[PDB]
Amino acid sequence: MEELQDDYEDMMEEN
């Protein structure tokens, strides 16, 4: 329900 899941912090963003 959040965006921020579990193989996630804000450095999956780019590719």
Structure tokens at 4: 């921020």
DSSP string, 1-15: --S--TT-SSSSTT-
In the numeric block, the tokens 């959040």 are attached to 2
Cα distance between residue 14 and residue 8, in whole Å: 12
CA angle (15, 1, 9) in 5-degree steps = 35
Rounded to 5°, the CA angle 11-1-8 comes to 15
CA distance 10 to 3: 11
Residue type, 1: M
Alpha-carbon span 5 to 9, nearest angstrom:
8
**Determined by which method?**
NMR
